[PDB]
Ligand binder design. Structure first.
Ligand SMILES: Nc1ncnc2c1ncn2[C@@H]1O[C@H](COP(=O)(O)O)[C@@H](O)[C@H]1O
Length: 508
């Protein structure tokens, strides 16, 4: 049963059961379906169906976000989710390359909001349309794009991963069946919908008839409020990045007693530290922990493995598990040949979860996707190895990093930093003494200025970067110098610059 038919079924059978909950607001399955059907109708009156143009859905975790997501696919348009977290210029870039002809913001027209070069409308005024609706044949289907999520692009511009219904349906069927999340449970949603991790809870919940429960950025900053919301949520499934749960764990009160009904933790998008797993197994004896791996290009996650005490003591580094049933995952050397067990190589993913590629970016798709031995495959850029059918992720081959669960390209940050009128060159160094990245240091060659003090220059640049880059991509520290060290080849000497940056670190 297709995701959409499943959502309609629940709405027809259990209309009054809650589908969505966020900041005191609730949306029943009937309200969800009937509203998304109305938005879908309203949408077909403002844009053309000639193309399968994307529809940006802008907001945070309002009930209107999902009502709009569903409205787009039901109208026949893939949607591009955009969090308030994403700044205006970046939003302008997504618009520009996506070809999107409509932007819906779940909240009322934000006052003095940054105007965009696109037809803009609030979810509210969309719904004031007659009680119209769309016919089943309009809904997105098969390999037509369902959603498009943009991630970091090394060339300095976000690239959009196209996830077709089939893609998602493959992901959703996998989660709902092979994980104890079925049964109409309450799912937590912490990740903004602009990140695909959210999809791990959003749709398997909707397909299984569960109730989604959001915890917004407001509650996230005020620990007390958060734990309170979590306390009342009565959640059963916890889906988030390991980083977020790690933050919660710092509070001794975060335990089975705060969440008596919590029984399933779903993690993905980043390294799940043994310490986090170890700890969770302690404060939540009634909940099983799952570690899953995968890139956005392969629809959230394609590997899986329950984390038990047995597994913890069996390895210093948690494995990412066994390949999704229908997926074919293997290790390939540089030459592009399959390696044997235990031998380190690059992770490649082939199967129905793989995205057709980057929207309007053929050359990029060209380098990353390809037809392996039938299956459509993807070069993850992750180094790794398999052992007894169990996959292990071991680092990066490129300049793509993970900072507190956030995916980003050092070269993209360098691009944006280099754009400031006060910058000539820029090199971002990630401080990772051991395994994980702790923060970023920007090595900059400034143009020429009148700023009396450095902090003023740093401030000016950082104030600029806030318009094109999400806050988490802006380097914490900024150091300045005269020249960017280069190697023989003519490449940027990142190894040497890092050493430079740390030496200057001891000079106060
Ligand atoms: N479970 C995991 N354990 C370790 N690393 C992971 C895991 N899941 C994802 N990653 C890393 O995060 C990257 C994907 O980022 P994203 O597109 O935001 O999901 C993967 O290519 C890995 O580098």
């Amino acid at each position: 049963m297709k995701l959409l038919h499943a959502i309609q079924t629940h709405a027809e059978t259990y209309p009054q059961t809650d589908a969505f909950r966020s900041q005191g607001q609730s949306l029943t399955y009937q309200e969800l379906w009937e509203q998304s059907d109305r938005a879908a109708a309203a949408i077909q009156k403002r844009i053309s169906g000639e193309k399968k143009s994307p529809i940006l859905v802008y907001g945070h975790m309002e009930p209107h976000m999902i009502v709009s997501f569903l409205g787009s696919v039901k109208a026949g348009h893939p949607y591009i989710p955009v969090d308030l977290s994403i700044p205006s210029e970046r939003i302008a870039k997504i618009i520009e390359s996506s070809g999107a002809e409509l932007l819906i913001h779940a909240a009322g027209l934000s006052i003095d909001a940054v105007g965009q070069q696109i037809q803009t409308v609030s979810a509210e005024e969309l719904l004031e349309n007659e009680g119209g609706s769309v016919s089943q044949d309009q809904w997105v289907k098969e390999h037509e794009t369902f959603y498009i999520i943009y991630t970091s692009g090394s060339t300095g511009n976000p690239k959009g991963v196209q996830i077709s219904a089939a893609n998602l349906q493959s992901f959703t069927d996998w989660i709902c069946a092979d994980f104890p999340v079925s049964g109409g449970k309450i799912f937590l949603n912490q990740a903004p919908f602009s990140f695909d991790l959210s999809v791990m809870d959003l749709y398997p919940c909707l397909q299984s008839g569960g109730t989604l429960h959001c915890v917004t950025k407001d509650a996230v900053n005020k620990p007390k409020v958060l734990f309170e919301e979590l306390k009342k949520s009565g959640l059963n499934v916890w889906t988030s990045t390991p980083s977020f749960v790690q933050m919660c764990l710092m509070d001794p009160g975060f335990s089975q007693d705060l969440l008596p009904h919590a029984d399933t933790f779903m993690f993905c998008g980043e390294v799940l530290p043994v310490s986090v797993a170890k700890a969770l197994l302690e404060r939540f004896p009634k909940a099983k922990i799952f570690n899953t791996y995968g890139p956005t290009e392969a629809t959230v996650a394609v590997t899986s493995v329950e984390i038990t005490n047995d597994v913890i003591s069996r390895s210093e580094s948690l494995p990412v598990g066994f390949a999704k049933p229908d997926m074919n995952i293997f290790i390939m050397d540089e030459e592009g040949q399959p390696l044997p067990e235990g031998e380190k190589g690059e992770i490649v993913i082939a199967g129905p979860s793989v995205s057709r590629g980057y929207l309007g970016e053929p050359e990029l798709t060209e380098k990353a996707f390809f037809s392996h031995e039938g299956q459509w495959a993807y070069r993850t850029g992750d180094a790794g190895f398999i052992q007894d059918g169990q996959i292990f992720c071991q680092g990066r081959l490129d300049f793509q990093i993970k900072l507190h669960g956030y995916r980003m390209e050092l070269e993209e940050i360098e691009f944006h930093v280099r754009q400031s009128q006060y910058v000539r060159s820029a090199v971002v160094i990630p401080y990772q003494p051991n395994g994980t990245v702790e923060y970023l240091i920007a090595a900059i060659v400034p143009e020429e200025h009148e700023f009396e003090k450095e902090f003023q220059l740093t401030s000016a640049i950082k104030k600029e970067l806030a318009a094109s880059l999400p806050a988490y991509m802006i380097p914490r520290k900024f150091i300045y110098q005269d020249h960017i060290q280069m190697t023989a080849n003519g490449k940027i000497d990142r190894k040497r610059i890092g050493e430079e940056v740390l030496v200057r670190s001891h000079h106060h």
